[PDB]
């Protein structure tokens, strides 16, 4: 019944004042993109930074299994848009936040479906 | 000024010289370029390499097959393949490799010495960043280097599709004469220096549109001496200007034709299409790769 919970350990390490995971791969891009959360090529808008997806995945970066039956990664091989104000910790951002299945935007960071 | 280009390519006249090899002494050796906020050198370097490759007659087929050697960093990620994957058409098969473990956005990654890497298919583009710092022995004769360059030369000859292209990193001390000679088996070639790393003797040796036979005879010791002579006498102003305009970055999907011809069918007519970036010659089967593992 045991299973390591890296997501919780990272969140708790962040709360206790630990320096975020560094060296996420930030891309050069126009910053005139759609602003959607996870895309096949960089799509940052003016308020976002675009990063290589694998470098922003906690499980990829810690060399641990992805938490789902088929150990599939929804970040690897794609680009993740991170709000510029949160770009100091892209790994924590993707962990804590959710993508609207209709917008493609981050809930509370671009999704306007609830208006 | 060349400060608004992505970098500087070795002028043809320097290629035609017969200089003797001397030590590389760069005027701007001390300086660094000012990178945009939070951008890594290797993202900026690969961005400029790709911007320059946009100006060449690269064959861009459907199912482009690209392989990238030396793709890891000492922090375990792959910034170069992230740029290649941004650059290449969506759906391009991108394979990654390095001696040391790293996580990657490539479709497949092999860890181990490049000599352990084998592929069944041929490739449309080969990118290499491999480099051994132990070659920078300024206290001794700068001879042609073996090691991964031996693998790269054979890999080009055996697994590069006719019409495909190559960009292989060299430096003052990290270079190989046969690789220079192999440049004469392409329709065109150059040594390209990124503007962002112009204080380094690094260049990418680029072979554009592989022909599978010698189009010209190149002595590789002479050509590396010519390359150093050019770098020694032509200071390049460090610059990150081209990084701020990415509006035209993506590689144009040309839909270049792919055909399976054997050898006797490659006319001067075919060689001509190859030379213009309009043809790729290889099978288009499944892509299968493997890494050799030594057991005790
Ligand atoms: N035979 C091979 N097969 C497969 N992969 C190969 C092979 N040789 C090399 N590589 C891979 O190429 C990537 C680029 S070299 C990065 C570097 C640059 C500098 C530079 O600029 O001063 C310096 C180093 C360096 C610095 C201090 C100590 C040290 O030990 C090294 C490293 C790299 O991840 C390395 O593992
Ligand atoms: Zn992952
Ligand atoms: Zn929404």
| Contacts B76 to A, Cβ<8 Å | 23, 61
Beta pairing partners, B67: B95, B126
- DSSP string covering B211-278, please? -SS-SS---HHHHHHHHHHHHHHS------GGGG--TT-SPP---BEEE---STT--HHHHHHHHTT-
Query: Is B252 a catalytic site residue?
Result: no
Report the structure determination method: X-ray
Closest among B292, B250, B260 to B87, alpha carbons compared: B250
Cβ–Cβ below 8 Å for B86 and A26: no
Q: Are B60 and B255 in contact (CB under 8 A)?
A: yes
Distance CA B192, CA A102 (A): 45
CA A110 to ligand 3 centroid distance, Å = 8
Length of chain B (residues): 296
Closest Cα to atom 29, ligand 1: which residue? B133
State whether residue A12 is helix, strand or coil.
Answer: helix
Distance CA A103, CA B272 (A): 49
Place of tokens 């990418």: B204
Q: Are B159 and B123 in contact (CB under 8 A)?
A: yes
**Residues near ion ligand 3 (Cβ under 5 Å):** A 100, 102-103, 111, 113
Q: How many CA atoms lie within 13 A of B223 on its CB side?
A: 25
Using the Cβ of B41 and the Cβ atoms of chain A, whether some distance falls under 8 Å is answered with: no
State whether residue B190 is helix, strand or coil.
Answer: strand
Least CA distance to B108: which residue of chain A?
A77
Token pair belonging to B51: 């911007």
Q: Are A59 and A67 in contact (CB under 8 A)?
A: yes
The gap from C-alpha A85 to its chain's centroid, in whole angstroms, comes to: 13
- Cα–Cα distances (Å) from A100 to A47, A80, B141, B250, in that order, read 18, 14, 61, 28
Distance CA B237, CA B92 (A): 34
Token pair belonging to B211: 């022909």
Which of B42, B80, B85 to probe the A interface (max A CBs under 10 A)? B85
- Check the annotation: does A24 bind a ligand: no
Task: Write the CB contacts of B286 (distance below 8 Å, at least 6 apart in sequence).
Answer: B120, B121
Catalytic residue among B98, B169, B178, B181: B169
Cβ–Cβ below 8 Å for A52 and B79: yes
Closest among B52, B57, B56, B266 to B162, alpha carbons compared: B266
Least CA distance to B93: which residue of chain A?
A77
Distance CA B251, CA B87 (A): 6
Cβ–Cβ below 8 Å for A52 and B85: yes
Closest among A88, A89, A101, A115 to A37, alpha carbons compared: A101
- Asked: is B7-291 a CATH 3.40.430.10 domain? The reply is no
Closest among B263, B292, B296 to B110, alpha carbons compared: B292
Kindly provide the resolution of this structure in angstroms, with one decimal. 2.1
State whether residue A99 is helix, strand or coil.
Answer: strand
């Amino acid at each position: 019944a045991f299973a390591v919970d890296a997501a919780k350990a990272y969140k708790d390490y962040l709360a206790s004042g630990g320096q975020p995971i560094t060296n996420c791969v930030k891309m050069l891009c126009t910053h005139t993109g759609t602003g959607q959360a996870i895309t096949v090529t960089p799509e940052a808008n003016m308020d976002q930074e675009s990063f290589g997806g694998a470098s922003c995945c906690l499980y990829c970066r810690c060399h641990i299994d992805h938490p789902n039956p088929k150990g599939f990664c929804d970040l690897k091989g794609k680009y993740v848009q991170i709000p510029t104000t949160c770009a100091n910790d892209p790994v924590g951002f993707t962990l804590k936040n959710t993508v609207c299945t209709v917008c493609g935007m981050w809930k509370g960071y671009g999704c306007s479906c609830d208006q | 000024s060349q400060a608004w280009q992505p970098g500087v390519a070795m002028p043809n006249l320097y290629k035609m010289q017969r200089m003797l090899l001397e030590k590389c002494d760069l005027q701007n050796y001390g300086d660094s370029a000012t990178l945009p906020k939070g951008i890594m050198m290797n993202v900026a370097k690969y961005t400029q390499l790709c911007q320059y490759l946009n100006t060449l007659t690269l064959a861009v087929p459907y199912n482009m097959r690209v392989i990238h050697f030396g793709a890891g960093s000492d922090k375990g990620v792959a910034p170069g393949t992230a740029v290649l994957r941004q650059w290449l058409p969506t759906g391009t098969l991108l394979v990654d490799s390095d001696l040391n473990d790293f996580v990657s956005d490539a479709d497949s990654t092999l860890i181990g010495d490049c000599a352990t890497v084998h592929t069944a298919n041929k490739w449309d583009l080969i990118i290499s960043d491999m480099y051994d710092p132990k070659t920078k022995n300024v206290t001794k004769e700068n001879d042609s280097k073996e090691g991964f360059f031996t693998y790269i030369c054979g890999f080009i000859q055996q697994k590069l599709a006719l019409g495909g292209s190559v960009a292989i990193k060299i430096t003052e001390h990290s270079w190989n004469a046969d690789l220079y000679k192999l440049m004469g088996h392409f329709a065109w070639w150059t040594a390209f220096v990124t503007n962002v790393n112009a204080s380094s003797s690094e260049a990418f040796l680029i072979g554009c549109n592989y022909l599978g036979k010698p189009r010209e005879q190149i002595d590789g010791y002479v050509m590396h001496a010519n390359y150093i002579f050019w770098r020694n006498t032509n200071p390049i102003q460090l610059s990150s200007y081209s990084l701020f305009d990415m509006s035209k970055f993506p590689l144009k999907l040309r839909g270049t034709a792919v055909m399976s011809l054997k050898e006797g069918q490659i006319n001067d007519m075919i060689l001509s299409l190859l030379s213009k970036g309009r043809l790729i010659i290889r099978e288009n089967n499944r892509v299968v790769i493997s890494s050799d593992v030594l057991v005790n």
